Design a protein around this ligand. Structure first.
Ligand code: HEM
Ligand code: HEM
Ligand code: HEM
Lengths: 372, 372, 372
């Protein structure tokens, strides 16, 4: 995915690589207004140019930043959320200094975002990359996520996708409770310093208890998942600027909540216990009972969410949320095309088209971090 | 060409894969108007969202469809016709039910389109893809096209490009007349059912008799070609919707009418008979007589078309047709850029740019069709 | 770089390959005006269509050409100059006939562009490609550039990048002075004829003498470079038209002026002589003295330029030049997006996106030229 990965630097972005993008951005920004702000637009371009001339970089106005985060969301071709991009709360943390402070900002986010199940979308933007030596990073892939443990006999326990990170956490001093649903700690890096680990206050992590509307025994097999899907390891590019730390969140779809993960020895087990029900024939592969169980688990999940009043992207939600997004544009008194975000970028030997602003992937920090 | 091929499905398009595209389309549509229709635009987006919420899909207004077919034409980078996209007649057949009915619609098209040589561009849109199990398809590559037969000794007779399809037709019960210009039958598939074959009424197929302005013996070698170039196997994508059956037509260019196909034992023969003329030396390859003959055949073709008053895209035609297209826009009282059609699509692992609406290729039906 | 290379032809561009592009261009052009020129726009499209119909090609109005050169500059993703695209002087030489005349036009350019160090950006556009058999070409890569000689013992003398071209010049009758800073002659090709070589009048080539602000011995090692960076071998594509000869110029950045070219036996030598200074230890690779010297050479260069008052793209220059570019747009009483230049081009088997107008690379002429 190297195309969509924006890596680390060790020196500020050159003028010839910053100025053009800053200009394009500011034009894009001022081009959004129904009512033009000519005098302001020209003076801003001047301000920014002189600022890059004198300081070597530039700062975004809170309003420019807000716009950037929303546009980058609008420019996320995989995200169904891009549909209602105006429904985003932006938390400005560009004045942050330490991991201690990062944690507070992160807790505020979780708190705001969770809202007792009535999930709200938000993004916390930490200081932008300066020289690439003083980066702010969240080593975690997601704010909330279960630990994955490599058991002696070879089987995994917990989230199989977090094995490498869990190990890291252990190496960093985190005491592993060898359970199936252990919420991983936040590994926060501020000002390029070594990362610091913080346990996430249990009260802040809302979890959905799995139960089926028909099968009363469902709750007996003790399955649960966290309500907040928040990405922590991405980078926001905007007008040449780079924000290595800017975690955001949305809400689940329903059809994807991963553990029903039809994979290995993790899958098989939960799937057989199920057969206890209606299609009790788990002794043979003649009855494709697995199809029955999977379909039913999705039912238990969907049901669990709606009954525990935790927002999920069902058909009604998708439409209602989109309407709310349209109400915001109407009260403002046509949209700026997606085309207005495509920038021709000539990287080594090929003319390619890139979107900006945009949420890029990054290289896992421990792979590049230089220990103090 | 897998990039430009939109294949078969076996389940409706997911919400997260439909809604964004529907929205983008409706925005694109309402963005065309010189005079904005704010109240209507917002209510339409609402209507469609609620419709996808409740029905799982949506229907286009005839006017939206018309717009879609024209824009998709405008988005056909190979088609010189894209120059005058407003000159298109749209035949709505989204209410069609059987192959019997398809045939009637198809005959109407040919009739309208042929217009005794005064070729007119048209497109017949059949029902959109629902679950991918009830598809409408024209198994033919073109509405009108000559059969290709594999003779015992190995030589081919007729159109070499239609060998596989001709065989299919034979397998489907069509009696092969082993001639050089046998018009293939229409293999129509409706509502996902098995295809039904219909012979095309000879009166509907206009053919141009080949003759040279100077060589009176030209007509003696009995060469002819059909006047109507119509593609039958493409798919129209629009706002997430897919129309597997939507044949369209234009008119010939003159320089391409394929049989002068410098290929094998099919070519060589017609080319030698020619040498009977001005450069009678067909005993040696010292006189590049082939160049002489080819140039002359193109002359006979071009001449044949203009004398038999069958529209062909010559220099005058190109300009006149473009003017007619400009007269339509002027009477309406600036154009919406092509950029407004490019949509960033994140398919597996790569950020690519796609045009929409657009005419995609498809997989030959007999290769995927499940027999009843 | 074959993607970005527009090669030679031997027959005019076909209608189906010209008309669409001409139309798109003219639309793009008339779409720039703050004040629409409806009557003029429509009549122009008509004019051009009829012109291509009758003549087989079309001529651009000087104003359309000016626009084309500026937009193509705006569409040069590597060029920091694209920032101030309105600051361009266009020299129309589409009426040029001979190499003699080309030379005069080229001398005027150098003269205007050099302006005693106060560098000004300009472009000289020679006759457009007709049938591809009567091309105007500058065989040189740059208007001004030092010769590169392959010495007997194997070492190179001068610009290592110009070895093949220098040889060509020698073959063409140019007497090689075997120095380090010999300005190469102009190899001009007009109307598809054989190229003619012209020595560039020394008075026209402004050179910067290298000296350090602190080290008085710097001037002693006699280093110099030319002030004018001008590309001579590119092709401008616009509305389907192709201009094989259209040299342009800008000014240096400072950080790139190549000879500090850390390469072979050319590098090493100048680098050691340096060590004579502050870090005199050139006997060992324990002291990374090379880093010291390189940094210092860049200092001598930058200093040499500013003291000899030869324009260079430093931070102040970048901002000041951009302001000058904004003053031009303000006095005209929002910009047309970059997206409005992207054209979907279906070349063999793939749907790609191209920019237009644009400055393409070309195949080195001597590799394709047919001698008379
Ligand atoms: C409003 C609720 C939201 C929903 C339902 C939603 C849903 C999704 C889904 C389903 C995916 C793609 C598939 C997957 O990774 O599971 C995704 C990806 C993404 N979303 Fe969201 N999203 C929401 C909010 C957000 C917000 C608020 C932002 C940013 C401000 C955002 C940015 C992205 C990005 C950048 C991706 C790419 C993920 C990747 O490929 O690694 N999303 N979103
Ligand atoms: C008005 C007369 C028309 C002319 C002269 C014309 C001409 C052409 C030509 C010369 C090609 C490309 C080369 C070839 O395949 O032979 C082509 C391709 C195409 N045309 Fe047309 N066309 C016309 C009308 C139409 C119409 C009415 C539509 C659609 C509404 C259309 C859609 C397309 C598409 C989608 C292709 C792609 C064919 C492929 O690559 O398989 N054309 N057209
Ligand atoms: C105003 C001063 C200018 C500056 C500082 C400037 C600077 C540059 C730089 C730094 C590069 C890329 C890296 C390199 O090749 O060294 C470049 C490339 C380029 N510039 Fe300029 N440029 C200027 C003016 C122009 C003008 C006037 C035009 C055209 C009208 C232009 C067209 C291009 C093109 C087409 C390239 C691509 C070169 C290649 O990749 O081979 N530039 N310019």
């Amino acid at each position: 995915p190297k195309s969509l990965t924006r890596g680390p630097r060790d020196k500020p972005t050159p003028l010839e690589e910053l100025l053009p993008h800053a200009i394009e951005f500011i034009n894009q920004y001022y081009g959004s207004f129904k009512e033009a702000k000519i005098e302001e637009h020209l003076a801003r371009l001047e301000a920014v140019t002189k600022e890059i001339e004198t300081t070597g970089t530039y700062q975004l106005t809170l309003d420019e930043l807000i716009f950037a985060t929303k546009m980058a969301w609008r420019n996320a071709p995989r995200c169904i959320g891009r549909i209602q991009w105006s429904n985003l709360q932006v938390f400005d943390a560009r004045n942050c200094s330490t991991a201690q402070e990062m944690f507070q900002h992160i807790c505020r986010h979780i708190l705001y975002a969770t809202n007792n199940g009535n999930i709200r979308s938000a993004i916390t933007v930490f200081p932008q990359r300066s020289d690439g030596k003083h980066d702010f990073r969240l080593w975690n892939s997601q704010l909330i996520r279960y630990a994955g443990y490599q058991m002696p006999d070879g089987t995994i326990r917990g989230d199989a996708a977090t094995l490498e990170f869990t190990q890291l956490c252990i190496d960093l001093g985190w005491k592993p409770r060898y359970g199936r649903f252990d919420v991983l700690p936040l590994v926060l890096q501020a000002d390029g310093q070594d990362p610091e680990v913080f346990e996430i206050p249990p009260d802040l992590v809302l979890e959905v208890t799995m139960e089926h509307p028909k099968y009363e025994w469902f709750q007996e097999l003790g399955l649960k998942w966290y309500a907040l899907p928040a990405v922590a390891n991405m980078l926001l590019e905007v007008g040449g600027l780079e924000f290595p730390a800017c975690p955001f969140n949305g809400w689940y779809m329903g059809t994807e909540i991963g553990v029903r993960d039809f994979c290995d020895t993790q899958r098989y087990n939960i799937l057989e216990e199920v057969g206890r029900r209606m299609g009790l024939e788990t002794h043979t592969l003649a009855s494709l009972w697995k199809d029955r169980a999977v379909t039913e688990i999705n039912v238990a999940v969907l049901h669990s969410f709606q009954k525990q009043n935790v927002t999920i992207m069902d058909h009604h939600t998708a439409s209602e949320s989109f309407m709310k997004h349209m109400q915001n544009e109407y009260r403002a008194r046509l949209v700026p095309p997606v085309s207005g975000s495509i920038t021709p970028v000539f990287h080594q030997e090929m003319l390619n088209y890139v979107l900006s602003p945009f949420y890029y992937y990054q290289i896992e920090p421990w792979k590049t971090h230089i220990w103090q």
